[PDB]
Structure formats: C-alpha cells, structure tokens
UniProtKB/Swiss-Prot annotation, chain A:
Disease: Complement component 7 deficiency: A rare defect of the complement classical pathway associated with susceptibility to severe recurrent infections, predominantly by Neisseria gonorrhoeae or Neisseria meningitidis.
Compartments in which it is found: Secreted; Target cell membrane
Organism: Homo sapiens
Similarity comment: Belongs to the complement C6/C7/C8/C9 family.
Protein name as catalogued: Complement component C7
Residues listed as glycosylation sites in the UniProt record: 35
Purpose of the protein: Component of the membrane attack complex (MAC), a multiprotein complex activated by the complement cascade, which inserts into a target cell membrane and forms a pore, leading to target cell membrane rupture and cell lysis. The MAC is initiated by proteolytic cleavage of C5 into complement C5b in response to the classical, alternative, lectin and GZMK complement pathways. The complement pathways consist in a cascade of proteins that leads to phagocytosis and breakdown of pathogens and signaling that strengthens the adaptive immune system. C7 serves as a membrane anchor.
Protein's gene: C7
Self-association and partners: Monomer or dimer; as a C5b-7 complex it can also form multimeric rosettes. Component of the membrane attack complex (MAC), composed of complement C5b, C6, C7, C8A, C8B, C8G and multiple copies of the pore-forming subunit C9.
Record PTM: C-, N- and O-glycosylated. O-glycosylated with core 1 or possibly core 8 glycans.
UniProtKB/Swiss-Prot annotation, chain B:
Family in the record: Belongs to the complement C6/C7/C8/C9 family.
Full protein stretch here: 359 to 406 of 934
Disease entry from the Swiss-Prot or TrEMBL record: Complement component 6 deficiency: A rare defect of the complement classical pathway associated with susceptibility to severe recurrent infections, predominantly by Neisseria gonorrhoeae or Neisseria meningitidis.
Protein role: Component of the membrane attack complex (MAC), a multiprotein complex activated by the complement cascade, which inserts into a target cell membrane and forms a pore, leading to target cell membrane rupture and cell lysis. The MAC is initiated by proteolytic cleavage of C5 into complement C5b in response to the classical, alternative, lectin and GZMK complement pathways. The complement pathways consist in a cascade of proteins that leads to phagocytosis and breakdown of pathogens and signaling that strengthens the adaptive immune system.
Protein's name in the database: Complement component C6
Subunit-level organization: Component of the membrane attack complex (MAC), composed of complement C5b, C6, C7, C8A, C8B, C8G and multiple copies of the pore-forming subunit C9.
Gene (UniProt): C6
Location in or out of the cell: Secreted; Target cell membrane
Length: 49, 48
C-alpha cells in the first residue's frame, strides 16, 4: 500500500478488500455561562418622644 | 456490494472543511427604592 498520511509503506492482504488514506475528522462544542445575583436590603427607624 | 457500480475515470481530489458557531448573551437589571417618613406633634396648654 502506498504511503498515505502514515508510515513509509504498508502491506495489505487478500482477505482485506481496501485501505483508505482519506483523513476526515469532526468536532462539536457546547459551552455555557450564567450568573444569578440577588440583593435585598430593608431599613426602618421610628422615634417617639 | 463489495466493488460497486461505477469507477473513477476522471475527477478531482482535495480537502474541505466547515465551521459553525452560535453565540448568545442576556443582561438584566432591576432596582427598587421606597422611602416614607411621617412626623406628627401636638401641644395644648390652658391656665385659669
Ligand atoms: C457573575 O457573572 C459573570 C459573567 O461572566 C462571571 O464572570 C462571574 O464569575 C459571576 N459571579 C458570580 C457567579 O459570583
């Protein structure tokens, strides 16, 4: 077998029907980011004289 | 099924790729203010 995307040479056999040198690679990504913030403040003041 | 129906007489051989990206962003703001003040005073005086 001719050198395709590999070593110097390779040897096939009769039972093996084919060898391929077509390099196809895929990929996928799913990234997320978030933030939830809460801030509650309460105050009271009463004076009696 | 092993060898096919057609064979390559003439054509081309090359590379190809593709990229797809999706981005989203959300920003939300909320503020609250409440102020209340009350003052009451009375005075009475009598002399006889
Ligand atoms: C708030 O959200 C921002 C958005 O990028 C993030 O960088 C930050 O770390 C968050 N803070 C938190 C969750 O306390």
């Amino acid at each position: 077998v001719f050198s395709g995307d590999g070593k110097d040479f390779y040897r096939l056999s009769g039972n093996v029907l084919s060898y391929t040198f077509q390099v196809k690679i895929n990929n996928d990504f799913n990234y997320e980011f978030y933030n939830s913030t809460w801030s509650y403040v309460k105050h009271t003041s009463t004076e009696h004289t | 099924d092993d060898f096919g129906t057609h064979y390559f007489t003439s054509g081309s051989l090359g590379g190809v790729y593709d990229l797809l990206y999706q981005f989203s962003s959300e920003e939300l703001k909320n503020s609250g203010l409440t102020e209340e003040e009350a003052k009451h005073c009375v005075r009475i005086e009598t002399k006889k």
